């Protein structure tokens, strides 16, 4: 018969899912940024530019004011409209003569004799064009479009575990187990060798696997515990849908107190553990201790949940069981993000190198 | 006694191997290629070259025909033979005057006054030499030699699971369990506390762990199932070698319906799960439920497979159990491949940057 | 009742820790080095320098001797003191006229007419300044400070498993189980539903989970074995602290014969397996088969270890259980190291590219 501790294996596998919910899934390697370094290179270039170039960014009546493009439209014989926003952003702090003179001294361009200034200008313009071409690589905007946020991932994990965007509180306010469709008895709710369960998410599957009820508390209801049964008082023959207090006494078997540094491999290993504990029969696959007939919670039957989507002839969990598919989506999005962070590293490092060379007065003369 | 579900843990571990066979192990991150970008840079260089350089690649009697090196041997006072193949490939489409004039307009070299053309040529020749030096890095050809194919990996996994290069079909045509050496009784086939098994691969180990036979179907033969025993009809005291129908009723407990994105970590975790379920005794290590004496399939004995290669005094599975060693080889080859893909990324990104600069007419003047 | 094989799951999880101890945790991807390539670039630069520059590194009375900076202090009107150590290291082999003439021929600078030499010098000086700026990136010294050693990691793993810096030998010389605090009886030592254990490390936890004693050898003492019980003879009601022979008969259930290529993911999966097998009760969490009351080793009680640090209301193992926290530290240090190796790759590849260009006589003329 099924007794104390018999479902420890399944509980561990399901809790490895549950623990990733709430706001515990953390995205560490995050937005690798190079825009400040690029902006610094662009502003160095504008500072080094001839004063008649900076003058194009000034209002005709007030030298300290940025040019208005209705007041002074850009010349049509130029590609200036294609670059004006970035140029004007570089020029704005420089419209102040005190800020500009400071930047010239800071970048070591002050006092440079004309020929030496020309050669410094040439190297800076070359390095700036190189910085733009590295920062504007297509696999940069692509990589950028592949990055997600801790937020988006957290919401999708909560969907697979709770069919909700946020984890329900300790009383499970707003939550209704089994999507409101629980009826009749435990085996109708949790499934059998011939019928699928009503559990569409990870939390309700854990409830089928681990909840005691009013008849098994002294026996099979201890499958996931050691000392005492969860004590739900679940009476599915009278009130099929369990209460939030009932659900929380099962959730507290899992670690909802820590955090997990998300990783596609972490998600994979957890999904694989659940998926391969599925016992494939002719009509259903069963997760949990199972002796005979159905997942009624009786010590002679089963403490388990059943799925019709995978069998000994068809189905793969991360594609055909909806809640495991949704969690596989998080792994997929984590992989893309992880590769992007790696790809966005090269421009970042190269732009730092360029900014260092642009501030080396000796190099500016050599590379000219 | 051993009964329904007692081997779910071991089945899950073994099926995590079996599911990687057939053509389900997929290599995602594949050949990172930069040869098209390099070829484009080389053809840009040839187009920009002086017309008397392109003329060296033409037949003396037909300007549209490539030079024949028997008809017109290359000068010995040059390193031209060391570069001719790549140069001739760049020059071939350019031998057509219409294609060449188009490429000149496309690369924005047409109409350039002589001094501006010379400076553009200088920058392109410099960028092309840089592209070659990046593309010809030694850790590029090395990385290239470390890359494998989904095919080679799939064949080695099928060797560890089936001792064959392809997964046997549903009737196991062409396959003979236990390499034709099964004899006497189940315990002679599957091993004991004193003797090793006849199972040399993963599939036959799963058979020892999970097959019912004609005597245990109502008891220990349900160790890996829920509702019904596999129903092999295996009668090893009369016909020791099971049939293909018998083997398939056990294989269908595993997920042969999906695919796995291969990963050294995936392989590691799966090998580690199997290896540490091995129960180390003085003379053998046992995988599977074991109560007494041997792996006979009796409810009082064992549903298991034994190996003499590892014990409580010696042996490590991924080195001393042949089938686990072969699968560790796939992990090793996956690691090399994964690092190579990463190393081949840098040349790829740099060549894209160079091609962008070479097509920027403003940069070609600045960098000269 | 608890019997043969009932703790195989827990043993596998704990042995996955134990196997990482001793000197079996191997750091593969190790120090990515670029200093030899940098030193080669710096020495190429010094060789190409004007002879009057090399002369600054010579003693005034002996041209073959390095300048002494007390004898001939460096000029104050220069930044020479900021670069002298690296310059002098590049110059030292060149003070020998035969070595210098050889290096000039080797780098193909001999016989170069003056204008061609000047242009070669210009390109080499530019490439050398670029090499320095890449090699001196801040995320290089940072990455360098993040790298650890197989040694440091091995010592911290041995702390989590043994509370010692090295793994005890087969007789456990120098080791005292349970930090010398074992007393009274098995349940006082290994814990209960109300009390924590005396086991502060991984080895002593495995002892609580898997050791037989003088009363359970024929029953619960076989929870982690197949054929024969470990045979400790442990008699905690008389001599609470087990002997080294006793401890070794339990350790030999784990694989101490191989090696593991360390990986944060490897550590994570192993920590997660242990952490989620912890059965959370109101006052303790229990690892191991548990039927009633305590971890006394009786077949009706438990073969297990208990922790008060995590419960069904608080605690996360990798932060609140000291030995699991220490092992999580190894994972954290492995992640930093793995990212560093990746970041230190870019300078390495770029310096190889520069050294190749500096040795290409054709490029030295083009890039001038
Ligand atoms: C770092 O800082 C530097 C400055 O130090 C900055 O350089 C500036 O770059 C921009 C963009 O590359 C340059 O913009 C060019 O400006 C010229 C000059 O236009 C003025 O002068 C002419 C008289 O010669 C007037 O007619 C005109 O009204 C302006 O007052 C333009 O002629 C250029 O436009 C032509 O070329 C473009 C291609 O580059 C075409 O897209 C465009 O349609 C124009 O084509 C015309 O001329 C072509 C000549 O080849 C011809 O083929 C076409 O048929 C057509 O007739 C261009 O807009 C600007 O001058 C630079 N400033 C200085 C002081 O050098 C860098 O941009 C900055 N780096 C970064 C990355 O921010
Ligand atoms: C991008 O596109 C450019 C063109 O825009 C292309 O440039 C070509 O590069 C190749 C390889 O670098 C150059 O090949 C050289 O050609 C000269 C010229 O040979 C002709 O003219 C001489 C008369 O001066 C005739 O005697 C001869 O028969 C040819 O008609 C050769 O002299 C060069 O060979 C010498 O130097 C090599 C080292 O670079 C040696 O390996 C070789 O043995 C030769 O050594 C001889 O001269 C040495 C002088 O230093 C001397 O030391 C030796 O003792 C010996 O006497 C070389 O083959 C070619 O000219 C370039 N073309 C143009 C138009 O510039 C790039 O290759 C292309 N980029 C890429 C990456 O594809
Ligand atoms: C690769 O190999 C090359 C050689 O091929 C090597 O180049 C050497 O680089 C160093 C460092 O960049 C150069 O050092 C400079 O040396 C000059 C010359 O000093 C001598 O001559 C003057 C007379 O002109 C004497 O007065 C003096 O006593 C020496 O005999 C120095 O003048 C330079 O110092 C000034 O500039 C530095 C900034 O770069 C300041 O930090 C320093 O305080 C000095 O400032 C003074 O002059 C400034 C002028 O702008 C002025 O603004 C200040 O107020 C102040 O008055 C500097 O030390 C050396 O000359 C190069 N050698 C050659 C032959 O070219 C590369 O270093 C090497 N690459 C690598 C990476 O190893
Ligand atoms: C589960 O199976 C037991 C044993 O046959 C039976 O008593 C229950 O009614 C059933 O749900
Ligand atoms: C396995 O062990 C059982 C129980 O002792 C015995 O009956 C079988 O004959 C043996 O193979
Ligand atoms: C463990 O529990 C058993 C069964 O109740 C009891 O006999 C032992 O004394 C206790 O330690």
Author numbering:
A (entry chain A), B (entry chain A), C (entry chain A): 24 to 391
Q: Can you provide the manuscript's text about this entry?
A:
Long-term immune evasion by the African trypanosome is achieved through repetitive cycles of surface protein replacement with antigenically distinct versions of the dense Variant Surface Glycoprotein (VSG) coat. The mature VSG proteins are attached to the cell surface by a GPI-anchor, and consist of two main regions: (1) a large, N-terminal domain (NTD) of roughly 300–400 amino acids that is most distal to the membrane and (2) a smaller, membrane-proximal C-terminal domain (CTD) spanning 80–120 amino acids beneath the NTD that harbors the GPI-anchor. Therefore, at the heart of antigenic variation in the African trypanosome are the NTDs of the VSGs. These large subdomains are elongated folds centered on a three-helix bundle scaffold.
The third crystal form (VSG11WT-AS grown in ammonium sulfate and solved to 1.75Å resolution) contains two molecules in the asymmetric unit. However, these two monomers are not arranged in a standard class A type dimeric arrangement in which the three-helix bundles, top, and bottom lobes align alongside each other, but are instead “tail-to-tail” with the lower lobe of one monomer interacting with the lower lobe of the other. In contrast, the crystal packing is characterized by a three-fold trimer identical to those seen in all the class B protein structures solved to date, including the alternative crystal forms of VSG11. Therefore, the assembly of VSG11WT-AS is most accurately described as trimeric and not dimeric (and certainly not dimers in the sense of those seen in class A VSGs), providing an interesting example in which the contents of the asymmetric unit of the crystal do not present the likely biological assembly, whereas the crystallographic arrangement does. Intriguingly, these two independent monomers are characterized by a significant conformational change in bottom lobe of the protein. This change consists of a 12-degree rotation of the bottom lobe from one monomer to the other.
